[PDB]
């Protein structure tokens, strides 16, 4: 994603312009980041099990490395199987090539032979399932963002009491105090630029996937009804003027 390239560029520029005054070793510490991340995982794990946290992590991974199918390529595909059914019925749907799991599941339920109610119930259950899955991932990362600064300040306090146990020199208090504050800095950065942004991007991917899934169930319901692609064109592009994609258009 171009947003990911912008993320990499911003990361590099921010680091380079932060570490310019002195050396990178003052703002880099594996112990501080380890303290913050370990304490935050432990706290969230008291309220989420290992499986639900790994699920949230894997959904975040899917939301970052991969990209949701565009709701325009989706239109091309839906009108394609609309033409296929109009020329040769539902018997032409299976040999087609589909790269989206949800339309494939819908049509594989359609081929067997089922009326509108059962297929609609199955599709709505799947849409609600994926929406809830993304919602729990956003909840996990909101919890991570809420607890990361608290763990960073606890780490800072522990570092400060460790510093107050190691004195006798006017010159070590400054570097020691800086290393102690590094934990709070890492907690703030992880809260504001990782965990809350990851939760926000998870909510964004939830919105994109929910919009795509309503588009797909409506497309499959129209194809099962056997409607022609004309009125279908309008009744599916009208859903493309909601959310943020209707903001980006001019």
């Amino acid at each position: 994603l171009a947003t990911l390239l912008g993320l990499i560029g911003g990361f590099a520029f921010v680091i380079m312009a932060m570490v310019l005054g002195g050396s990178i070793g003052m703002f880099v510490d594996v112990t501080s980041i380890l303290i913050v991340v370990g304490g935050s995982i432990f706290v969230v794990l008291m309220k989420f099990t290992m499986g639900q946290f790994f699920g949230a992590t894997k959904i975040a991974g899917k939301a970052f490395m991969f990209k949701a199918d565009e709701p325009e390529d989706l239109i091309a595909k839906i009108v394609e199987m609309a033409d296929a059914a109009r020329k040769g019925g539902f018997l032409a749907l299976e040999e087609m090539e589909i790269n989206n799991t949800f339309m494939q599941k819908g049509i594989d339920l359609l081929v067997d032979g089922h009326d509108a109610d059962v297929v609609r119930a199955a599709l709505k259950k799947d849409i609600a399932l994926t929406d809830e899955r993304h919602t729990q991932g956003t909840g996990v990362f909101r919890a991570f963002g809420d607890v990361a600064p608290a763990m960073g300040m606890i780490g800072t306090l522990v570092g400060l009491v460790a510093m107050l146990s190691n004195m006798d020199d006017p010159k070590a208090i400054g570097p020691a105090m800086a290393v102690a504050l590094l934990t709070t800095l890492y907690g703030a950065i992880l809260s504001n630029m990782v965990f809350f942004p990851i939760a926000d991007k998870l909510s964004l991917r939830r919105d994109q996937e929910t919009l795509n899934r309503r588009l797909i169930m409506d497309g499959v319901l129209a194809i099962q009804d056997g409607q022609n692609p004309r009125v279908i064109d309008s009744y599916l592009k009208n859903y493309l003027n909601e959310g943020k994609r209707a903001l980006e258009i001019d």
Binding site: V161, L164, S165, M167, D168, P170
Partner: protein, 51 residues
């Protein structure tokens, strides 16, 4: 969601950090008496379990 803490606490923390910056400044152009810093250092070690 929990209601949170009032805005005055945030103002108080921002002011506290400003005062940190300026007190770091006053200690930046200063020469600590080495003699007077080890009685207090011994006292903090004594009061913190080390001694």
């Amino acid at each position: 969601p929990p209601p949170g803490l009032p805005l005055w606490m945030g103002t108080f923390a921002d002011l506290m950090s400003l005062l940190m910056c300026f007190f770091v400044l006053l200690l930046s152009f200063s020469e600590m008496d080495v003699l007077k810093f080890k009685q207090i250092a011994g006292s903090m070690k004594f009061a913190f379990g080390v001694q």
